[PDB]
Design a protein around this ligand. Structure first.
Ligand SMILES: COc1cccc(C(=O)N[C@H]2[C@@H](O)[C@@H](CO)O[C@@H](S[C@@H]3O[C@H](CO)[C@H](O)[C@H](NC(=O)c4cccc(OC)c4)[C@H]3OS(=O)(=O)O)[C@@H]2O)c1
Length: 138
């Protein structure tokens, strides 16, 4: 049990083989979830499940540079459900973030921010009860 929004420091940034695990439960009638891997004010990787975007469920991924959002990468597959416990795993690979939800591969997101060792915070926010947030090296 953690306060949301939650800031998880990533000491010395991220690196290939680093696995980030987020456990929580989606609130009833959730509207959004967000993971924000930050390089200072920039958002290297924004992972944003939207539960009701024009009555559709979509996950939006993007990068924010100098306060400007870039080109979104949208995904049809939506493994989250209001009310239900989830696990998000984000594995840093040399050329993308690889995301699995509930042990099923979901998406990958190519590195736009290439100073991986400066991506030194993860913000976790949105309509969840957050159980734990941690990392390990595989
Ligand atoms: C609907 O179908 C498609 C298909 C392909 C592309 C888009 C498009 O780029 N959509 C964009 C575009 O309309 C853009 C124009 O300003 O706005 C975004 S919304 C924006 O998308 C960002 C990612 O690209 C990011 O998710 C923004 N959210 C925030 O920055 C943010 C931060 C903290 C709290 C928070 O609460 C909602 C929001 C979020 O801003 S918010 O006002 O709705 O909260 C939208 O997805 C749409």
């Amino acid at each position: 049990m953690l306060i949301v929004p939650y800031n998880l420091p990533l000491p010395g940034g991220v690196v290939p083989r680093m696995l980030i695990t987020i456990l929580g439960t989606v609130k009833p009638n959730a509207n959004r979830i967000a993971l924000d891997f930050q390089r200072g004010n920039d958002v290297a990787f924004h992972f944003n499940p939207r539960f009701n975007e024009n009555n559709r469920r979509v996950i939006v991924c993007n990068t924010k540079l100098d306060n400007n959002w870039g080109r979104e990468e949208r995904q049809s597959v939506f493994p989250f459900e209001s009310g239900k416990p989830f696990k998000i795993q984000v594995l840093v690979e040399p050329d993308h973030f690889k995301v699995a939800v509930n042990d099923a591969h979901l998406l990958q997101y190519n590195h736009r921010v290439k100073k991986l060792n400066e991506i030194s915070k993860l913000g976790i926010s949105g309509d969840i009860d957050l159980t734990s947030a941690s990392y390990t090296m595989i």
